[PDB]
Amino acid sequence: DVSFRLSGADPRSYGMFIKDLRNALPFREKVYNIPLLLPSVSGAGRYLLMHLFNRDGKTITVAVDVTNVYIMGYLADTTSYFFNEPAAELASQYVFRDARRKITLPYSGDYERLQIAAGKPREKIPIGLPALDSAISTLLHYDSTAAAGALLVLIQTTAEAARFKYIEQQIQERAYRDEVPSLATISLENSWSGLSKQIQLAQGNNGIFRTPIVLVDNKGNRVQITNVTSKVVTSNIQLLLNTRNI
């Protein structure tokens, strides 16, 4: 399992954690030097456990599907909470099986439902390491509106940071102060699975994309990736979603 401890966290130790997390996801191949995530895993081995601790040393254990890096649910001492979606009820079968009580959150774990449940879009919620510490704290006590908002910060500060090295650097920057994500980062977030498909569709097409991914990213508004030499590919994206799940 991977652990992180906000107490005395700095940008380095968080980098270590994010490295550890990438290093836990199995893969068989690299596609253009990037790990390609397995199309499925089976048994309890589909799920990775993150132990997160807040500044006071309280902990939650999050469970991550190692095939897409989706958060499935989490345990706060004796209760488990899973999202209201089929994979998450599947996960429930394999993890936190000694929770005294299991709650299903009234939403599924995707950005659109979570934002509806939270009352703010992602663009208006600060992320950083202080926020992650506050999200952990929020989660230790059930409040489903508060959790929609804390799970928005938890996903982005862990999963999205493992996928994109840019976002990992955003958070590192925001280690001692929170700040809303860049348009850049929201764009990346949204494009993972499109990027992932195009990079894979480019083997045997000469590194060229069949359809060009337009990022807002850091050309203010409106960039277009069209082949694999672009740096969102050579330098940024860290993990590929297997096209069996796209």
Side-chain angles (χ1 to χ4, degrees), residues 6 52-60 74 76 130-143 146-147 150 154:
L6 269 290
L52 259 33
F53 306 68
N54 71 355
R55 277 153 210 335
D56 309 338
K58 263 98 214 66
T59 183
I60 60 162
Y74 58 94
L132 168 69
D133 168 77
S134 154
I136 298 155
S137 297
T138 300
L139 292 180
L140 276 181
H141 345 268
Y142 189 55
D143 177 325
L154 175 71

Side-chain angles (χ1 to χ4, degrees), residues 115-192:
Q115 297 178 163
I116 287 169
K120 307 218 201 72
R122 253 131 77 234
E123 311 88 75
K124 309 213 246 293
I125 295 168
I127 53 176
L129 292 187
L132 168 69
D133 168 77
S134 154
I136 298 155
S137 297
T138 300
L139 292 180
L140 276 181
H141 345 268
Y142 189 55
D143 177 325
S144 85
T145 305
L151 280 159
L152 281 193
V153 158
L154 175 71
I155 286 157
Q156 284 170 302
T157 66
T158 58
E160 304 289 26
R163 294 170 179 150
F164 294 109
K165 168 147 281 288
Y166 173 70
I167 290 179
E168 172 191 12
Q169 282 164 355
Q170 294 281 301
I171 302 303
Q172 286 187 317
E173 262 171 57
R174 296 168 165 65
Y176 301 113
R177 178 178 96 223
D178 294 337
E179 192 183 337
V180 289
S182 0
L183 305 77
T185 87
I186 300 296
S187 197
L188 246 28
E189 278 172 3
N190 287 337
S191 309
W192 183 59

Side-chain angles (χ1 to χ4, degrees), residues 59-75:
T59 183
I60 60 162
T61 301
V62 182
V64 189
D65 185 333
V66 304
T67 66
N68 52 19
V69 210
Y70 296 161
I71 309 275
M72 283 298 96
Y74 58 94
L75 166 82

Side-chain angles (χ1 to χ4, degrees), residues 12-232:
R12 168 134 228 243
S13 57
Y14 170 72
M16 275 186 259
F17 156 63
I18 283 301
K19 131 109 55 286
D20 282 14
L21 164 60
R22 276 154 191 157
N23 280 173
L25 310 187
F27 70 99
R28 224 93 71 197
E29 307 166 53
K30 302 221 183 178
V31 168
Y32 285 117
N33 228 58
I34 308 148
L36 180 84
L37 295 186
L38 300 170
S40 61
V41 189
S42 281
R46 194 184 172 97
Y47 302 106
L48 157 83
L49 262 36
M50 315 196 270
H51 307 295
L52 259 33
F53 306 68
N54 71 355
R55 277 153 210 335
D56 309 338
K58 263 98 214 66
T59 183
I60 60 162
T61 301
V62 182
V64 189
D65 185 333
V66 304
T67 66
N68 52 19
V69 210
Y70 296 161
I71 309 275
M72 283 298 96
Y74 58 94
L75 166 82
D77 51 276
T78 55
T79 307
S80 62
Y81 311 79
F82 286 91
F83 294 107
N84 191 41
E85 63 201 30
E89 179 57 46
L90 202 248
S92 98
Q93 245 191 282
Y94 300 97
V95 314
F96 322 131
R97 291 280 313 295
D98 61 321
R100 281 193 303 211
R101 154 178 44 255
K102 159 177 160 189
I103 287 163
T104 296
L105 304 161
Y107 39 63
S108 53
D110 68 82
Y111 282 154
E112 194 188 273
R113 266 305 288 118
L114 295 175
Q115 297 178 163
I116 287 169
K120 307 218 201 72
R122 253 131 77 234
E123 311 88 75
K124 309 213 246 293
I125 295 168
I127 53 176
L129 292 187
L132 168 69
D133 168 77
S134 154
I136 298 155
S137 297
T138 300
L139 292 180
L140 276 181
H141 345 268
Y142 189 55
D143 177 325
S144 85
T145 305
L151 280 159
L152 281 193
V153 158
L154 175 71
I155 286 157
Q156 284 170 302
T157 66
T158 58
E160 304 289 26
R163 294 170 179 150
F164 294 109
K165 168 147 281 288
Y166 173 70
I167 290 179
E168 172 191 12
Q169 282 164 355
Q170 294 281 301
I171 302 303
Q172 286 187 317
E173 262 171 57
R174 296 168 165 65
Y176 301 113
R177 178 178 96 223
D178 294 337
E179 192 183 337
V180 289
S182 0
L183 305 77
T185 87
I186 300 296
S187 197
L188 246 28
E189 278 172 3
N190 287 337
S191 309
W192 183 59
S193 98
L195 258 166
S196 280
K197 182 189 176 221
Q198 298 313 331
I199 298 181
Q200 287 166 78
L201 245 30
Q203 296 192 311
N205 193 193
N206 292 321
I208 295 141
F209 281 12
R210 320 287 179 153
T211 327
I213 295 292
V214 17
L215 300 180
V216 152
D217 236 74
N218 244 148
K219 170 192 145 60
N221 232 48
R222 245 316 248 79
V223 197
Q224 242 177 328
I225 330 304
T226 72
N227 69 72
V228 302
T229 60
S230 188
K231 75 247 180 79
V232 45

